[PDB]
Amino acid sequence: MHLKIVCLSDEVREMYKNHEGDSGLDLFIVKDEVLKPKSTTFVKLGIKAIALQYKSNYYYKSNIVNTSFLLFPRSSISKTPLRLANSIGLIDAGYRGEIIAALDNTSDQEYHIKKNDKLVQLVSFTGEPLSFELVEELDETSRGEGGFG
Amino acid sequence: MHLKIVCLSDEVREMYKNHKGDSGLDLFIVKDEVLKPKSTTFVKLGIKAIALQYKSNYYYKSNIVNTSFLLFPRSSISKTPLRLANSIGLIDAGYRGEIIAALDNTSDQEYHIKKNDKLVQLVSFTGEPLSFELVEELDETSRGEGGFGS
Amino acid sequence: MHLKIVCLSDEVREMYKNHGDSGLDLFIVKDEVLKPKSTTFVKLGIKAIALQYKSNYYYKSNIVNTSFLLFPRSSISKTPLRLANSIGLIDAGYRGEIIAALDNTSDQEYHIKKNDKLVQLVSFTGEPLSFELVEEL
Ligand SMILES: Cn1ccnc1C(NC[C@H]1O[C@@H](n2ccc(=O)[nH]c2=O)C[C@@H]1O)c1ccccc1
Ligand SMILES: Cn1ccnc1[C@@H](NC[C@H]1O[C@@H](n2ccc(=O)[nH]c2=O)C[C@@H]1O)c1ccccc1
Numbered sequence: 269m270h271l272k273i274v275c276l277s278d279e280v281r282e283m284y285k286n287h288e289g290d291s292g293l294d295l296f297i298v299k300d301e302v303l304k305p306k307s308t309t310f311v312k313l314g315i316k317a318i319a320l321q322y323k324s325n326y327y328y329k330s331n332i333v334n335t336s337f338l339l340f341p342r343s344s345i346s347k348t349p350l351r352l353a354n355s356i357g358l359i360d361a362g363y364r365g366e367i368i369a370a371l372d373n374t375s376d377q378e379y380h381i382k383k384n385d386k387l388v389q390l391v392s393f394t395g396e397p398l399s400f401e402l403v404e405e406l407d408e409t410s411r412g413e414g415g416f417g
Numbered sequence: 418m419h420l421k422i423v424c425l426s427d428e429v430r431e432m433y434k435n436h437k438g439d440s441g442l443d444l445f446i447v448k449d450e451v452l453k454p455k456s457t458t459f460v461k462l463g464i465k466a467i468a469l470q471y472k473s474n475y476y477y478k479s480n481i482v483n484t485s486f487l488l489f490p491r492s493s494i495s496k497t498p499l500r501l502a503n504s505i506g507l508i509d510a511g512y513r514g515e516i517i518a519a520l521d522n523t524s525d526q527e528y529h530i531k532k533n534d535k536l537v538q539l540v541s542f543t544g545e546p547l548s549f550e551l552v553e554e555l556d557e558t559s560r561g562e563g564g565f566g567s
Numbered sequence: 568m569h570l571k572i573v574c575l576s577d578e579v580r581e582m583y584k585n586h587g588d589s590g591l592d593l594f595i596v597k598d599e600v601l602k603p604k605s606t607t608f609v610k611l612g613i614k615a616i617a618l619q620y621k622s623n624y625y626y627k628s629n630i631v632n633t634s635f636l637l638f639p640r641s642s643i644s645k646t647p648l649r650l651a652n653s654i655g656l657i658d659a660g661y662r663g664e665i666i667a668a669l670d671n672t673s674d675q676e677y678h679i680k681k682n683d684k685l686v687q688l689v690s691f692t693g694e695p696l697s698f699e700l701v702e703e704l
């Protein structure tokens with residue numbers, strides 16, 4: 269699966285210019301942030317992303333198409349008090365919004381995520397190796413980050 | 418992937434006639450229910466379902482088959498204190514029971530769910546788009562809601 | 568999909584020798600006390616690879632190793648244990664022991680017993696699973 273990732277700030281772009289014939293693509297925490305104790309915080313991952321797979325035959329009742337994909341916790345999240353609220357995120361084929369990780373802080377202390385933490389990863393519904401590239405837009409629409417003005 | 422869904426009551430049938438390219442199919446909470454604080458409740462979704470996909474050759478040591486499939490939380494469950502106790506439910510190809518969501522109320526107060534809330538969704542193992550239709554039975558067994566009599 | 572499982576001990580091998588569906592259950596292999604309000608890395612005492620047919624995938628001889636998944640069993644929900652990382656992703660390249668990160672959410676300790684089945688191995692496609700017990704991967 270191949271992902272096109274639009275970084276929403278330059279600080280993020282520099283993180284991903286760094287960065288793997290692997291199943292998951294790790295995502296960065298892009299900004300130091302405090303998570304209140306006993307809370308769910310919607311943590312903005314500062315990127316938009318489209319995933320491409322070869323067209324496939326599926327039952328329902330241009331070799332390369334958009335596809336839905338998954339936001340998984342990284343196994344090393346287990347070591348912390350944070351847990352993904354929604355278990356596993358399902359990003360649909362369309363999707364053009366900022367990817368959000370919803371993290372439950374299960375402790376009663378506040379928790380500091382730091383820039384460059386990796387808590388979550390994108391994963392293909394097929395488990396296949398992921399490749400990505402930075403692009404400036406996903407498509408022509410404003411939500412795509414493309415088009416005029 | 419195509420879901421044949423059997424609604425277990427008339428009330429549920431109407432909710433599914435009225436239903437709003439997509440990878441998950443939202444399921445309704447079908448009955449106002451109070452969930453106790455700090456507990457796990459097995460919330461009956463009032464439906465049974467099977468999933469149909471193209472037959473595949475798979476390594477294991479008409480072209481439409483029954484397939485196993487996935488029960489995911491909707492991401493809007495995040496706003497609530499309700500968490501899905503088994504993370505992602507696996508429903509096997511053969512399963513003819515009512516679909517249950519096991520919801521942990523992590524809050525220390527009672528949580529009230531309403532008829533028409535949508536907290537969970539069915540999703541295909543391959544993430545392809547889903548269609549569904551409402552049917553009177555899944556198969557000929559009683560558990561499947563079908564066959565002769567009562 | 569098909570799994571090659573190396574049992575890490577004499578005693579574990581037994582449990583799998585005396586064990587086609589969508590997930591393969593894994594045993595709790597030794598009695599253990601889980602502390603209250605805690606996360607424990609519970610060792611399952613197996614190594615495993617998974618084999619599926621090669622596929623064309625977009626990216627920029629019959630068989631290959633694929634990634635597979637570690638799901639909780641639906642029955643885990645009767646316990647106060649939760650899988651910390653929701654669903655475990657075991658990569659194609661992984662040769663180490665399989666661990667289940669379990670959160671004990673109880674304010675009391677919780678004892679797991681050998682022959683408990685709390686988690687299960689599932690394939691990316693939901694296809695029926697099979698395994699054999701080898702000596703090495
Ligand atoms: C938080 N928030 C504020 C406005 N919209 C939202 C959300 N919308 C879900 C979309 O986000 C995408 N989405 C889905 C799952 C996920 O884990 N991360 C996502 O970005 C595809 C889903 O379609 C939202 C996002 C994450 C957790 C909860 C809720
Ligand atoms: C709690 N309870 C009381 C009577 N039945 C149940 C349970 N049903 C397990 C089966 O239901 C199906 N099942 C599996 C996972 C799931 O998330 N939802 C389900 O309906 C397939 C599984 O085969 C049960 C249900 C949900 C979670 C845990 C346990």
Ligand SMILES: Cn1ccnc1[C@H](NC[C@H]1O[C@@H](n2ccc(=O)[nH]c2=O)C[C@@H]1O)c1ccccc1
Nearest residue numbers: 343344346608637655656657661664665666668
């Ligand atoms: C516990 N521990 C000590 C040294 N390394 C670890 C761990 N490392 C992750 C590897 O284990 C494999 N792994 C991944 C996810 C999972 O649920 N179970 C696993 O066994 C493949 C992953 O690559 C570890 C294991 C489990 C949860 C968190 C962390």
